[PDB]
Design a binder for this molecule. Sequence first.
Ligand SMILES: Cc1cc2nc3c(=O)[nH]c(=O)nc-3n(C[C@H](O)[C@H](O)[C@H](O)COP(=O)(O)O)c2cc1C
Length: 350
Amino acid sequence: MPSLFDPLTIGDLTLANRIIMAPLTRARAGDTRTPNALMARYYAERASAGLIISEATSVTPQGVGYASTPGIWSPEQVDGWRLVTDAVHAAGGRIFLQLWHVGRVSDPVFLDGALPVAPSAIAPGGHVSLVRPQRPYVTPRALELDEIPGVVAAFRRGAENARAAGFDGVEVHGANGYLLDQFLQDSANRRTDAYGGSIENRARLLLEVVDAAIDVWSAARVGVHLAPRGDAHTMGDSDPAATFGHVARELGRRRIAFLFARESFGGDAIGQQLKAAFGGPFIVNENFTLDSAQAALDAGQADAVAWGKLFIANPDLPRRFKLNAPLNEPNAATFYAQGEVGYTDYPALE
Ligand SMILES: Cc1cc2nc3c(=O)[nH]c(=O)nc-3n(C[C@H](O)[C@H](O)[C@H](O)COP(=O)(O)O)c2cc1C
């Protein structure tokens, strides 16, 4: 059984430990959506993580859903990300870019008046995050069949640009009710063409995006993110075990780097089903403590564990865990705010 502090190999890349930094949207890319020196220092100071998965990064204007979140479609953005990857590598870290398209989880304010796009014209519940004044999600536009290759081409170029920006790899964002998860689950995808109906058809787009990434990076440098509970952004599927199991089997057959599952452990968790179906490195996440995470590794339930909120507040989390030192508390007020306050001013032990 492995310790959290033992090395792990994902594909052909060795990680110094099994304490992973979860992808965290922080909205510090500013009006130009370009990564910058501040993000560089933020990531660099978390480089003692075995692996950093970057904040979700939009592969095209159409896949933007929040203010000041970065993209990976422009040459200006590539140069920005180069600052981040250079700084992370100088500090000894590894970093994967999370490739993102928000799909229906967006608003015309971010799309120059265009409707958000989706598998089917069905809006998610609640109100658009962060944007004031609060408003419901507008009903999205259902992608026409002949638009879907364009989405995949946007992901492919995203994966090309990540490679040009000097990342160690890319993670495909198939979770949290965003575009590929919308296609995946039958509450949001009600299509009757080849991208809807059956589990195979619903998983089709995700697998095409994964294959485009594999064409750019090879499978060894591609990860995928999933969230089986469907508990964010009005997700839900009639048979999660069947839907996600199929996806897990198909990704495992492609021998990708890892499968990252956001799913707190508990009575209804299907993570172990997904792990057996996948067969490769399995990263668990959500409400984990040091000890429950070590317990997961000891029981063969994960190969690595990711933390989000704790890495926000604790740049030196691995060493804090090592020493059983008190942890900083994260301040929700500055999760999405501008500038270095609540971003790079959380102190390391030193
Ligand atoms: C402020 C914030 C931003 C997040 N941004 C992303 C994101 O960009 N992409 C993603 O896949 N998950 C994102 N997440 C979810 C985290 O990656 C993680 O799965 C979740 O916080 C649960 O892990 P934790 O309990 O260790 O914090 C975000 C979470 C928070 C709190």
